[PDB]
Scaffold this active site. Structure first.
Site, short mmCIF file in Angstrom:
data_model
loop_
_atom_site.label_atom_id
_atom_site.label_comp_id
_atom_site.label_asym_id
_atom_site.label_seq_id
_atom_site.Cartn_x
_atom_site.Cartn_y
_atom_site.Cartn_z
N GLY A 257 1.31 -0.78 -0.27
CA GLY A 257 0.22 0.13 -0.18
C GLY A 257 0.87 0.85 -0.20
CB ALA A 258 0.61 4.14 -1.79
CG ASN B 11 -2.78 8.18 -1.60
OD1 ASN B 11 -2.07 7.87 -1.31
ND2 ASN B 11 -3.22 8.80 -2.50
CB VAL C 159 4.30 6.81 5.71
CG1 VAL C 159 4.00 8.53 5.29
CG2 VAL C 159 5.96 7.30 5.15
N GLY D 142 5.09 5.01 -5.40
CA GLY D 142 5.73 5.90 -6.22
C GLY D 142 6.07 5.52 -7.93
CB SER E 176 9.18 2.46 -4.74
OG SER E 176 9.55 3.45 -5.13
CD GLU F 213 -4.23 1.36 -10.24
OE1 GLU F 213 -4.07 2.64 -10.50
OE2 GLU F 213 -4.99 0.26 -10.62
N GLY G 209 1.40 7.08 -9.87
CA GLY G 209 1.67 8.59 -10.06
C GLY G 209 1.25 8.90 -11.51
CB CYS H 140 -2.26 8.56 -8.02
SG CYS H 140 -0.70 8.02 -6.46
CD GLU I 287 2.69 12.12 -9.27
OE1 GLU I 287 3.80 10.94 -8.68
OE2 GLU I 287 1.46 11.55 -9.40
CE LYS J 116 1.58 7.98 -23.25
NZ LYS J 116 1.30 9.61 -23.21
CD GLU K 163 -6.32 -1.23 -6.90
OE1 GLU K 163 -6.24 0.35 -7.10
OE2 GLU K 163 -5.15 -1.64 -6.14
#
Ligand SMILES: [Cl-]
Ligand SMILES: [Cl-]
Ligand code: NA
Ligand code: NA
Lengths: 495, 488
Positions: A155-156, A158, A185, A235, A238, A257, A259, A291, A392, A462, A469
């Site tokens: 997971g991210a 945000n 984080v 990102g 990553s 998924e 940015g 994103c 970004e 791209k 998802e």
């Protein structure tokens, strides 16, 4: 307003097989409250043996889960939905503490839409079907959509619990176990989700949660030979690292998924109040840490000045403040290192000659000096070669770009390695569909921004992603096809 | 000796700019078939720009206009079946009895299948509320690349290009350096059928070069690879580290054939023969672990020996030849190393185990059809894909055991069971970890049937409706007709 020290939480453990368990790595990390700089919690970091333990737990639970009837699985996921609805406000407060996003967002969006997707997939489990193909009177083929087995989600930070729900919901609905690694984080709500799934009746092992660092826990998951699929949100850089290692270790299916630098195209016939409202929502929600944000705003040259005034007016309404206050609609960034990166981008905007319409600095004064705040920022007079236009930023930084004609704006909108989202503002039927069909993005909004229905597949073109998802297709993508030929005629060997 | 073979870019043969060439050999004789030019980095860039231009023309056509062009190419492939098969036999060493019956027939079958499905490629529409709805488009990826293998050169070129072209893409295809010739013929056929220039470009070359340039190129949206696990890992890494491409991989296996206690052993032996010695054992889906009940093993071994004694190695253009040399002497060297490991690890050599010798055989990389028995799960020949004519026979005692042992592998391409029993057939097959499963048969791969691997044997699928869809990308479009609400 003082006397507001918040003490730290108990040390957070791993979640493996229906219980909290101490990591065997001997390593921990801290998660910070970005509004105060205070430590929220010490968190244990899953080591390589911990990952192995999670996989074996997941293999055992997956067997129980997949042997159930489809509707038994549906009912268990629905019970988790019911609990998430009941605990929405408690989970939203925790998410706000961990991420710095205003409670006005987290209590309305994060759990609501995470549970929306889980609820969606719960209802679709009985509709997951294979095919049957007649070849001839004496032979036919049928297919099974089998679970992949054990899958991993990464997971991210945000949208922590929303991402956890959007990955785990189709994975579990398709009959898999998922091992989920939250961002270091923002590890806290994923651990709450694991308890809720158990409380709903999910078999032990089917959703295990391993907090940790990306270079360690994340890599161990991407390398494990018995994980069949990795789904990563984060990102672009990553993502490249995860995709490589999943191949160079054991051949896993992949979803990414990433940015974007999504264009918002304001047509010459657009109402500029609508356009400005859309541009605001496409840039300053979650303090710009989304994103899909429309961070390149293309405005016809003849409307640029008027559009700038309308943006300035709306920016002046933004309400930064106490993240638990009803009227706050803007928060600090997720961390102080992230703010430093956003500030470097803002300074590059200045030094490359973009015109600062508003913002461009940290917020200051009582209550802000201890948080990772950046003022809502708008650059205009931007050109396509500028760093802030090409890259970004993932902060509250809108870039306004003027254009002359439709062919031009389509070219410039598409002239990027990104391809996550895009949108157009126009009342004209032909212009709306014609422009959108030419944009190289997976998520396109006409006269709106940001809604992501459970039914709607979302992901990038791209460099912005692999796979999708949400939607029916994502339930299917968490299964693997087995083709079975029944030959009832006599088999002919040529030997 | 053929003329020097050039690249095919934008509807014509063109000289490569690499300055590099390689040779392709006739594996039955050692003679040079052709000098072949190798595409360099600039050649790949030129092929991509050609593909971008042709893809635009191709995607702008009506669905039925695309369908008719692919159908014209099918018609040509049917007419040239024997000529193409003979070239394929020269390039690969596979008997004409195979190439004229299978390779082009089934390659064109898949092209014909996808040609008819182009008009049925549809998006979706989802109502949200009276004032808003979503619709999706299945758009072309754009320019995609296919990387072929040497065992079924033109069939692979067709199975990759057919769904890619039917979905509205242009494909750049790189054939194996071992077998470049029929892919170049295919490019001419597509143009003859009316395919716009640039939509199917063919770049012969080496893996370390041409293949790598394709995986690295920023304007290629997807790579589809068929070959060995080693090259697959390399292709997978570069495609990620370059421009995040979608990927499909069709790799090898160690597929189990489970003979049940109630199986007719003549049928079981016939299936095991076809699962092991077709294309001289050079087939990814081969059933190279043959599990036989202890009580029937001796009788089964005798029935295999009887059928092996019928195999006819010889003139590859003779009607009755059904066994060929291996594709190369280095490949034979590896297969022979596997055979030696079987001997030294204690498997019993039932037959074969050496090269073929004599006038007509000494110049080709022939290996005798080979059968080991008394095999155990720890043996190298049991654990690893050999990709030669080497069957491993394994005794088992009960159903739960054989399912465990069949699945106790990181491979997962194919599997099969031989049994007349209704419950046994479906019950066993449902528990096997393989993507391609055959009951009382082996080897048929209908165009309608998705095929690919579980676990380390592959990513994604080929054939079936799903593979047409997987060569498109979904764009979701929300139409908001109500007033948009900002919170600012
Ligand atoms: Cl331009
Ligand atoms: Cl066992
Ligand atoms: Na935090
Ligand atoms: Na050759």
């Amino acid at each position: 307003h003082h006397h507001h020290h918040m003490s730290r939480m108990a040390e957070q453990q791993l979640y493996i097989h229906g219980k909290f368990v101490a990591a065997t790595s001997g390593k921990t990390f801290e998660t910070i409250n970005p509004a105060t700089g205070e430590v929220l919690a010490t968190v244990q970091a899953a080591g390589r043996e911990d990952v192995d333990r999670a996989v074996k737990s997941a293999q055992q639970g997956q067997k129980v889960w997949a042997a159930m009837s489809a509707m038994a699985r549906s009912r268990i996921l629905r019970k988790a939905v019911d609990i998430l609805r009941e605990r929405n406000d408690e989970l939203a407060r925790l998410e706000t503490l961990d991420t710095g996003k205003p409670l006005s967002e987290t209590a309305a969006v994060d759990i609501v839409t995470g549970a929306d997707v889980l609820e969606y997939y719960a209802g679709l489990i009985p509709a997951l079907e294979g095919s049957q193909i007649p070849l001839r009177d004496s032979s036919f083929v049928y297919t099974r959509r089998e679970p992949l087995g054990v899958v991993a989600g990464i997971g991210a930070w945000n949208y922590p619990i929303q991402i956890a729900l959007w990955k785990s919901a189709p994975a579990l609905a398709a009959g898999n176990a998922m091992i989920f690694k939250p961002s270091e984080v923002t590890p806290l709500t994923a651990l709450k989700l694991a308890e809720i799934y158990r409380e709903a009746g999910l078999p032990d092992g089917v959703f295990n949660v391993l907090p940790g660092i990306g270079a360690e826990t994340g890599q161990y998951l991407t390398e494990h030979p018995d994980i069949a699929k990795i789904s990563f949100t984060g990102g672009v850089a990553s993502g490249k690292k995860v995709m490589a290692n999943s191949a160079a270790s054991s051949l896993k299916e992949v979803t990414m998924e990433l940015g974007g630098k999504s264009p918002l195209i304001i047509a010459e016939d657009a109402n500029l109040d609508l356009a400005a409202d859309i541009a605001m929502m496409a840039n300053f929600y979650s303090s710009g840490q989304v994103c899909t944000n429309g961070t390149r705003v293309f405005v016809p040259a003849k409307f640029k000045a008027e559009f700038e005034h309308k943006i300035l007016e709306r920016v002046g309404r933004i309400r930064a403040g106490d993240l638990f206050a009803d009227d706050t609609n803007f928060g600090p960034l997720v961390s102080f290192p992230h703010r430093q990166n956003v500030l470097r981008y803002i300074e590059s905007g200045k030094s490359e000659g973009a015109r600062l319409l508003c913002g461009g600095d940290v917020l200051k004064g009582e209550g802000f000096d201890n948080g990772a705040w950046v003022a809502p920022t708008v650059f205009t007079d931007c050109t396509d070669d500028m760093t802030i236009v090409r890259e970004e930023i993932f902060g509250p930084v809108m870039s306004i770009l003027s254009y002359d004609d439709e062919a031009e704006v389509i070219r410039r909108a598409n002239a990027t390695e990104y391809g996550l989202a895009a949108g157009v503002v126009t009342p004209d039927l032909n212009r709306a569909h014609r422009i959108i069909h030419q944009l190289e993005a997976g998520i396109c909004w006409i006269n709106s921004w940001g809604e992501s229905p459970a039914e709607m597949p979302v992901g990038g073109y791209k460099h912005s992603g692999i796979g999708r998802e949400n939607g029916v297709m994502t339930l299917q993508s968490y299964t693997q096809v087995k083709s079975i030929q029944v030959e009832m005629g006599p088999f002919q060997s040529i030997f």
